[PDB]
Amino acid sequence: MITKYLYDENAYDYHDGGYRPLKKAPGEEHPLNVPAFLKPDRIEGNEIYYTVTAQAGETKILPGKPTHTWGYNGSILGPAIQFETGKTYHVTLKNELDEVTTFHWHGLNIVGPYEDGGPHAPVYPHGERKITFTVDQPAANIWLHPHPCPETARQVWNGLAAPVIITDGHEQSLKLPRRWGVNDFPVVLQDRSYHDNQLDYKADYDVDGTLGDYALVNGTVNPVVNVTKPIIRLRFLNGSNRREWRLHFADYHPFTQIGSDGGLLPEAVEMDRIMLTCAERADVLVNFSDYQPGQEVILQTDDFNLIKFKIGDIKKENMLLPSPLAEIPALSVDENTPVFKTVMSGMDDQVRLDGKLFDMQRIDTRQQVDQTQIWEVSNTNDMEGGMIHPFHIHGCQFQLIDRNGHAVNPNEHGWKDTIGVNPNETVRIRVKFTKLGIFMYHCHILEHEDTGMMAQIEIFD
Ligand SMILES: [Cu+2]
Ligand SMILES: [Cu+2]
Ligand SMILES: [Cu+2]
Ligand SMILES: [Cu+2]
Numbered sequence: 194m195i196t197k198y199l200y201d202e203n204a205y206d207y208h209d210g211g212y213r214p215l216k217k218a219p220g221e222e223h224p225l226n227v228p229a230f231l232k233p234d235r236i237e238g239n240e241i242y243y244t245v246t247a248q249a250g251e252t253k254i255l256p257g258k259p260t261h262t263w264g265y266n267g268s269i270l271g272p273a274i275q276f277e278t279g280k281t282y283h284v285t286l287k288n289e290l291d292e293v294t295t296f297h298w299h300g301l302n303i304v305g306p307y308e309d310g311g312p313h314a315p316v317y318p319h320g321e322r323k324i325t326f327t328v329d330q331p332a333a334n335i336w337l338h339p340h341p342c343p344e345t346a347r348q349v350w351n352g353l354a355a356p357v358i359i360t361d362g363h364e365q366s367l368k369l370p371r372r373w374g375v376n377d378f379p380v381v382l383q384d385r386s387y388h389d390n391q392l393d394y395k396a397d398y399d400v401d402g403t404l405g406d407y408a409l410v411n412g413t414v415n416p417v418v419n420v421t422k423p424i425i426r427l428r429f430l431n432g433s434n435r436r437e438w439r440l441h442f443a444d445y446h447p448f449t450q451i452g453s454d455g456g457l458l459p460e461a462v463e464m465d466r467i468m469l470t471c472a473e474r475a476d477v478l479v480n481f482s483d484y485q486p487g488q489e490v491i492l493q494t495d496d497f498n499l500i501k502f503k504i505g506d507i508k509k510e511n512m513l514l515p516s517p518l519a520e521i522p523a524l525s526v527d528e529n530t531p532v533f534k535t536v537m538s539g540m541d542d543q544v545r546l547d548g549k550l551f552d553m554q555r556i557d558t559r560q561q562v563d564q565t566q567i568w569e570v571s572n573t574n575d576m577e578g579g580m581i582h583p584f585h586i587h588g589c590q591f592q593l594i595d596r597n598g599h600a601v602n603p604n605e606h607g608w609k610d611t612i613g614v615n616p617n618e619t620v621r622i623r624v625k626f627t628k629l630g631i632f633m634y635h636c637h638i639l640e641h642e643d644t645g646m647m648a649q650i651e652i653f654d
Contacts, residue, residue, distance in 0.1 A: 215408050242285075285321060294315075301326070308324050334454075379428045400542050459607055
């Protein structure tokens with residue numbers, strides 16, 4: 194059982210001068226918002242048609258005035274979007290905002306740079322963009338967020354993000370907690386400050402990554418979950434601009450991680466804490482069968498109360514998973530397997546990828562399709578006052594080899610698309626790109642990304 198946070202304590206977010214801790218949001222406690230699933234516009238057998246509109250609205254978060262928020266098909270965040278492996282999807286992307294945006298599917302394997310929804314894929318105000326893809330990757334917790342250069346940090350701050358679920362035959366075979374909103378929860382973790390009961394990104398802006406005073410979970414404050422059934426699935430996503438989340442129950446109740454960014458783990462991992470850098474997902478099961486019907490269990494990040502689990506008339510149930518949990522195909526790495534070294538350096542405004550800022554017309558690397566590649570990703574920052582950069586690659590899922598030549602963390606034997614790189618650390622990963630086109634890689638601290646800590650790979654035959 195993992196009893197440690199698996200990232201270097203020396204480099205955590207709370208060591209920075211100008212680090213602002215979470216504080217209690219005012220008003221009554223609310224039941225956790227669970228977004229309803231996006232309904233298909235039309236289903237011609239095996240082909241599904243979705244419409245996703247970026248739009249401004251008003252959300253009751255704090256008591257008093259409603260907050261002016263941006264959302265997808267709603268006032269804030271978006272609906273749950275279900276994809277199935279094998280199915281083909283025709284998505285209409287509509288921009289009903291008064292500025293340019295983009296529709297990036299973080300963790301989806303699709304052609305770039307237009308289908309992918311990078312900064313080369315603008316949708317102009319009152320504009321329409323139709324895309325077509327076939328989902329061909331395992332069941333995973335994925336997400337959609339705007340990705341225009343360099344307005345990404347602000348557009349996510351204003352509320353544009355949506356949890357996305359890929360499901361497959363195998364994941365359904367496990368018979369996990371499936372009752373959406375009772376058994377099975379999306380937990381989108383965000384942090385926002387309010388003045389006038391309103392968002393103001395310019396006011397709160399930090400170059401080194403913007404922090405919020407109040408914890409936003411699925412766009413609700415002071416969230417509560419009423420445990421009907423004892424075994425509950427929590428699909429954690431760190432949707433924050435910069436803030437790391439060090440999740441644990443107040444009494445360090447154990448829980449089981451079953452999923453990473455790119456699908457189910459090969460084996461279930463028991464633990465009593467977990468740390469998520471930006472854009473990382475953790476799929477965990479919690480057995481509340483342990484507690485009595487009248488009790489209250491509080492989920493915390495550090496010493497801050499995040500979400501209260503009010504246990505109701507619960508019936509005893511033993512939580513048993515298979516070993517192995519899932520079969521992950523190993524990528525074959527031989528002696529003539531090409532290596533590519535990328536160096537994350539600098540902090541605040543001095544942040545660089547291989548010493549360069551992002552240019553939309555410059556291709557930084559070129560790699561071959563369907564041939565597995567090794568990547569040495571290095572964080573050059575000083576272990577003294579350094580920073581954990583969450584490194585992400587578009588249009589793929591990769592496997593870890595080592596962290597500084599040593600063994601990989603217990604929750605990284607599966608598929609990932611973003612990894613936290615500690616100061617003075619070089620991570621070894623192997624990746625086989627399946628789709629042709631131009632793809633981006635960058636730090637997933639949205640202010641570092643906006644500054645230009647981003648580069649482009651072309652994939653060719
Ligand atoms: Cu992303
Ligand atoms: Cu992405
Ligand atoms: Cu960074
Ligand atoms: Cu990106």
